[PDB]
């Protein structure tokens, strides 16, 4: 299975979601940015790299955030903790960011794959 990670960029006491762009049936829903791991690369060299290019930020991949997620059977979705190092984050691949709470957590309109890390992002805010 083809690995996506994905960054829970908690700053401040808010966590990073981003409104994807695309495609039609997930543009306007919200998710935590990443991309796929190139063969040859570690999880954390693609997250870096995904949200160098997605956000302008420079992070520090740590744990896990929750469980992995099926995508469909080719591909899998991770989550990860992430830290700021340096830089600001910027939608320059999505529609829009917003730092959110613990109580805007569930209310989000969650890419569907995504919404199951709800409980884990409320957890982690808490
Ligand atoms: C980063 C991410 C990606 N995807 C899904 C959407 C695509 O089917 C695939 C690859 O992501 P992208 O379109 O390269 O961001 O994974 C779902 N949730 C996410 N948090
Ligand atoms: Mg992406």
Redo the contacts with the bound molecule.
Sequence with gaps: KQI?V?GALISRGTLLVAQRDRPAE?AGLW??????VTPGESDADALARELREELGVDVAVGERLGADVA?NDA?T?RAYRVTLRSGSPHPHDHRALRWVGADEIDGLAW?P??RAWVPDLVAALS
């Design positions: 996506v994905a997930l998710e935590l940015p990443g991309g796929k995508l591909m979705l890419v794959a995504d």
